[PDB]
Each structure stands twice: as structure tokens, then as C-alpha cells.
Amino acid sequence: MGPGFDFAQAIMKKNTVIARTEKGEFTMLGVYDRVAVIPTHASVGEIIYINDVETRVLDACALRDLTDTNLEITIVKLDRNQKFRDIRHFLPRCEDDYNDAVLSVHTSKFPNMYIPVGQVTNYGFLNLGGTPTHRILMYNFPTRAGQCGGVVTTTGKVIGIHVGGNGAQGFAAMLLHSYFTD
Ligand SMILES: Cc1nsc(N2CCO[C@H](C)[C@H]2C)n1
Structure with missing residues (x-):
């Protein structure tokens, strides 16, 4: 759109x-x-x-x-x-907050799904299903079962993958350039 x-x-x-x-x-x-x-x-x-x-x-x-x-x-x-296609040049180098992100999902259940999730907070620590977890991004959208692995992007950056939610908020693990150096 x-x-x-x-x-x-x-x-x-x-x-x-x-x-x-x-x-x-x-x-x-x-x-x-x-x-x-x-x-x-x-x-x-x-x-x-x-x-x-x-x-x-x-x-x-x-x-x-x-x-x-x-x-x-x-x-x-x-x-x-x-x-x-090598997309490593779209990965952020540092932990950060973002404006105006999209969460995109493609499965049997949810083909060609795109969600404008809006503002993304560097949340940091989350107890995710009982597991202490670091480098969590948070967005105020009621994400559901089926969306795990979903790609979080802004214009020109791939910033995270969707890993969970609490019914009101969604949570993504950061992607950093340093994870994919070779
Ligand atoms: C926030 C929101 N708006 S519609 C929706 N769902 C989940 C994905 O597609 C389903 C058919 C639909 C019920 N979730």
C-alpha cells in the first residue's frame, strides 16, 4: 500500500x-x-x-x-x-528502536500476510514462555499463533523475527549484522 x-x-x-x-x-x-x-x-x-x-x-x-x-x-x-539473495547489507549493526515497522508472514495458514505494527521499542529482557531472553523488540499489535518466524522490517532494514506475544503486544528477536559475518 x-x-x-x-x-x-x-x-x-x-x-x-x-x-x-x-x-x-x-x-x-x-x-x-x-x-x-x-x-x-x-x-x-x-x-x-x-x-x-x-x-x-x-x-x-x-x-x-x-x-x-x-x-x-x-x-x-x-x-x-x-x-x-544476500540481504546482510539490510541488517542493523546495533540494538535500536524503530518507527513504522511491518510484520510479514507466509505459511499454508497465512499466505501473503502483512501487518503494519507501528512503533518498535528496544524492550531488552523478556521472560518468553518461562525462558529469560535478551535483545527483544516490542510492538503494540495483538499477534497470534501462526506468526512466529514472521519478518519485521522498516524501509531499507530487516530488524527482527517474531518469536511471541501476550495477546496485546508482539515480541521479535533482533537480527544483527554481526550474527552473519563469515
Ligand atoms: C488482528 C487481526 N485482524 S484479522 C486477524 N486474523 C488473524 C489472521 O487472519 C485471520 C483470518 C484473522 C481472524 N487478526
């Missing part, structure tokens, strides 16, 4: 796949080469389904900060025959 949704759509059309684990279907953000991210509560194993194709997992790492606190991001490398 506007330049926010334009940027969000460009990311969804080229850098997302549908990931299925034993814990369900997730939006999964491809970042570069065969490297994607997913919420850690997806419980990635040795095998994952990517757009309904059985795919070996070459590596999976549940990220924690240097206080040894959960970040709720799992970096996955996929035994896929195709690379993602």
Missing part, C-alpha cells in the same frame, strides 16, 4: 521459505548462501521440510548472548540446491 509494504514484499518474495519441523509451520528468513534463521522454539533437527521438500540440516546453532542468555534465534544451514 506504501513504501514500507514495498520493502517488506521484496524481502518476502525472494528471501522466505516455508519451514516445517515437528513443532509446526514457520516463516523462515533466508539471509545469504544456504543460511536461514528461525525461532529456537521450532526445535530444528537433522531433517527439516522447506516448501514441502525433505531437506538435510548441515548445521544449526541456537544463539545466546555473552551473559549466556537465550536470544531465541537459531541459524540454520540447509542442504538446498539454491542460494538466497
Whole structure:
């Protein structure tokens, strides 16, 4: 509808796949080469389904900060025959607050879904399903089951992936450029 949704759509059309684990279907953000991210509560194993194709997992790492606190991001490398467009230059370098973000989801249940969530707060600490979690972004939209893995963007930046909510607010794990250096 506007330049926010334009940027969000460009990311969804080229850098997302549908990931299925034993814990369900997730939006999964491809970042570069065969490297994607997913919420850690997806419980990635040795095998994952990517757009309904059985795919070996070459590596999976549940990220924690240097206080040894959960970040709720799992970096996955996929035994896929195709690379993602490299979008690492759209990742923020520092923890920050944002205006005018969009949360975008693509699953069987919620195809081509875009939500203007508005102002995004650097919330920091959250007890997420009982797990102390750092680097949480918060937005005042009543997000629901089906939206985990959803991509949070502003014009020109990919800032987070949706990991939970409390019925009134939604919570995203930060994406930082430093997670994907090689
Ligand atoms: C905030 C909000 N507005 S409509 C909505 N949902 C969730 C996604 O699509 C469903 C069909 C619909 C019931 N959630």
C-alpha cells in the first residue's frame, strides 16, 4: 500500500521459505548462501521440510548472548540446491528502536500476510514462555499463533523475527549484522 509494504514484499518474495519441523509451520528468513534463521522454539533437527521438500540440516546453532542468555534465534544451514539473495547489507549493526515497522508472514495458514505494527521499542529482557531472553523488540499489535518466524522490517532494514506475544503486544528477536559475518 506504501513504501514500507514495498520493502517488506521484496524481502518476502525472494528471501522466505516455508519451514516445517515437528513443532509446526514457520516463516523462515533466508539471509545469504544456504543460511536461514528461525525461532529456537521450532526445535530444528537433522531433517527439516522447506516448501514441502525433505531437506538435510548441515548445521544449526541456537544463539545466546555473552551473559549466556537465550536470544531465541537459531541459524540454520540447509542442504538446498539454491542460494538466497544476500540481504546482510539490510541488517542493523546495533540494538535500536524503530518507527513504522511491518510484520510479514507466509505459511499454508497465512499466505501473503502483512501487518503494519507501528512503533518498535528496544524492550531488552523478556521472560518468553518461562525462558529469560535478551535483545527483544516490542510492538503494540495483538499477534497470534501462526506468526512466529514472521519478518519485521522498516524501509531499507530487516530488524527482527517474531518469536511471541501476550495477546496485546508482539515480541521479535533482533537480527544483527554481526550474527552473519563469515
Ligand atoms: C488482528 C487481526 N485482524 S484479522 C486477524 N486474523 C488473524 C489472521 O487472519 C485471520 C483470518 C484473522 C481472524 N487478526
